[PDB]
């Protein structure tokens, strides 16, 4: 019914009503970075992701 990967982590499960394979892929990963080239000159920033 279930199954792990090479990293020894449960992240796969077989559909009992479809006989298919549906992997688990979360969408919550990364960080938020801010670019501030000195506040004494300008007052503009840049949203940087990961």
């Amino acid at each position: 019914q279930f199954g792990r990967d090479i990293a020894d982590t449960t992240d796969a499960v077989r559909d009992p009503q479809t006989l298919e394979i549906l992997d688990i892929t979360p969408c919550s990963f990364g960080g938020v970075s801010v670019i501030t080239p000195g506040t004494n000159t300008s007052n503009q920033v840049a949203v940087l992701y990961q």
Binding site: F2, R4, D5, D8, A12, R14
Partner: peptide
């Protein structure tokens, strides 16, 4: 157990 393992030693 009923856990699928491939290319991994346990």
């Amino acid at each position: 157990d009923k856990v699928f393992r491939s290319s991994v030693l346990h």
